[PDB]
Amino acid sequence: AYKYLEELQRKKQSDVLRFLQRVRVWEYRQKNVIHRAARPTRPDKARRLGYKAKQGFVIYRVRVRRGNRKRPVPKGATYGKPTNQGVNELKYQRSLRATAEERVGRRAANLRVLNSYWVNQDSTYKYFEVILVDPQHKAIRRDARYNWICDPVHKHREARGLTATGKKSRGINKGHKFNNTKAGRRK
Amino acid sequence: MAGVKAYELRTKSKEQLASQLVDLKKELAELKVQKLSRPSLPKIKTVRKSIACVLTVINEQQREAVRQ
């Protein structure tokens, strides 16, 4: 079964994928910033990423906000070149869904987060859904086929960068790049 | 206690180590009612540190307790 689902949600828009994404988003949208877990929306390629299984269960949902970069201030200003001068249209190196992963963390790091999956997109957001495993918990480290997440440092890192999209938005390359730095370098 | 310690360490009741403590206390108090010239104290100090010996020896033999 898992396979059908996977390669099924692989065809977006498309009759079902759409007439579904619509009801859902029309739902989801309305339910508090982040609105922690229910029972795992799309379980398909969720396993690809250590699915639901953690810890016993726990996968929360969050609506990040869409768009570009809110350059604060009102001004400039600061000379401008090399703007500086520029404001309205800086673009966020962050990683839209990344932000999601972080806030989710905050909204409760009684757990630690294994990875985050997309789900839908308005013109006023981007509906991402994150996973967990409650290390400070049960089988999590007991039936620990996975105590990885449990050990000392590998935790809360749901935003020290060492996550996945950050790992990606940085340097998981190898060759043709200056992407393990740090470095800087070189003095 | 006033020792020892090796003494208070055994063994009269909480209602026994009791009037031992209450005793030393009415001591310390009167011992103060002295308050008159010098003052040494000296055994105000004695009576005191002892007051504690009692107090501490008193809050363990109720602990190893809870430890059962």
Binding site: - | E30, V33, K35, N59, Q62, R63, V66
Partner: protein, 94 residues
């Protein structure tokens, strides 16, 4: 409600609790011309406690207890005495 652990031990106590017979020049007088014992206290003076204290410790009885917070840290009480306690008389202690 419910439980399964707790606090520890009944520590303590907390009482005691009447300081050091605050008696000097004028105080003695209090316990003289007036018959009103000028003990002291522990700033955290439980108030009517003082009552229960003296009434217990020196044990005689008292009527009023007006109790200034002296300029020192000294929280000194001003106790009296019913037809009983005759001051110097209950100045067997001090």
């Amino acid at each position: 409600y419910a439980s399964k652990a707790v606090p520890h031990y009944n520590r303590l106590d907390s009482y005691k609790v009447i300081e050091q017979p605050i008696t000097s020049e004028t105080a003695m007088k209090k316990v003289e011309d007036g018959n009103i014992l000028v003990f002291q206290v522990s700033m955290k003076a439980n108030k009517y406690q003082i009552k229960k204290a003296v009434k217990e410790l020196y044990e005689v009885d008292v009527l009023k207890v007006n109790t200034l917070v002296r300029p020192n840290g000294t929280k000194k009480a001003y106790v009296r005495l019913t037809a009983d306690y005759d001051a110097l008389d209950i100045a067997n202690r001090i």
